[model samples]
Target: MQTDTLEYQCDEKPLTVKLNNPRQEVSFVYDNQLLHLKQGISASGARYTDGIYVFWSKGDEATVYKRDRIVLNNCQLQNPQR
Candidate 1:
């Protein structure tokens, strides 16, 4: 399983996103809890969700939401992931 890690710097706290290639899934640590989601349909950018939380990203910007509340906003890519 090939995977890449992306880090985002947010106003409240930092986020780490781990992408699992070929599996169509992404996992992240939020609020001291590990959340996992599968790739979902999106008109723009990449979006992953498991019904409860949604993670969307485009270019160097990323947004995380819990239901309708935006928990992590103003998140920018900290560095290129390999």
Candidate 2:
């Protein structure tokens, strides 16, 4: 009998962040809004999801940071091994 092997890789992409505060600086990262928000679940929690989020799947990778705050970051899609 023969078995098949599975391989996986991480693809990081850039993202854009629009803040509610006009004074706040914009940030970018290599990840989608959903992924970014999901990663921030521990830090920002529901507040992150409550904000007006937007994302696009283009380019390689990108990130957005408002001065010291991480507005957005790259996200990875997990795959299940059979």
Candidate 3:
């Protein structure tokens, strides 16, 4: 498995969600147009000790767009979820 960085354009800038390989520290970089993050998203921007807050499929475009929080330093996804 590998970490991925996903990006989505909703406005002038696109929101960035990164999932580290270790699945530890997730970094969400947003400017104005918020992408994801509501019920969960590491309030502390760290790990989900309580439990993993998101799920995704391997090589599946849908996984990238799912309303899930970045679960690592950054996923570094290239293709936009379809």
Candidate 4:
């Protein structure tokens, strides 16, 4: 965690943030919550389907989806694929 929230840095890529304000009824790892500049959930993960499902990526962006809507689509990661 930094001066404001947590952080996840994989190798030498964009630094993803641990979302301190993921929003209402959002799901994350260990309830620790999940980052970043320019938009919403960017912790290389997504909270959707009432927490029944989670989407993760290795890029420098993250998006929140609900009902086929782009709820939160911001610019994500934790141990992305190689």
lDDT of 1 by residue, 1-82 (tens): 4466666456676667777755377787677777897787876777877766788877477777876677777778775365
Each prediction's Cα lDDT score?
A: 0.71, 0.30, 0.38, 0.34
Ranking of predictions according to TM-score: 1, 3, 4, 2
Q: What is the C-alpha lDDT profile of model 4 across 22-66, one tens digit per residue?
A: 332323332234422223354544332334223333344544344
Count of clashes, each model: 0, 18, 13, 4
List candidate 2 segments past 4 Å from native. Answer: 1-58, 76-82
Model 4, C-alpha of 63: deviation from truth (Å): 0.6
At residue 73, candidate 1 shows an lDDT of 73
Encode model 3's per-residue lDDT on 9-82: one tens digit a residue. 43333435445545443344444332333223433333223233343323322122224654332343456332
Regions of candidate 4 where Cα sits further than 4 Å from its true position: 1-58, 76-82
Q: What's the lDDT for candidate 4?
A: 0.34
Global CA lDDT computed for model 1: 0.71
Candidate ranking under lDDT, highest first, comes to 1, 3, 4, 2
Best by lDDT, which number?
Answer: 1
Query: lDDT: which is higher, 1 or 3?
Result: 1
Model 3 worst lDDT run, 10 consecutive residues: 57-66
lDDT of 2 by residue, 1-82 (tens): 2221111233433323332232122232334433332223222222333233432222233233344444445533232122
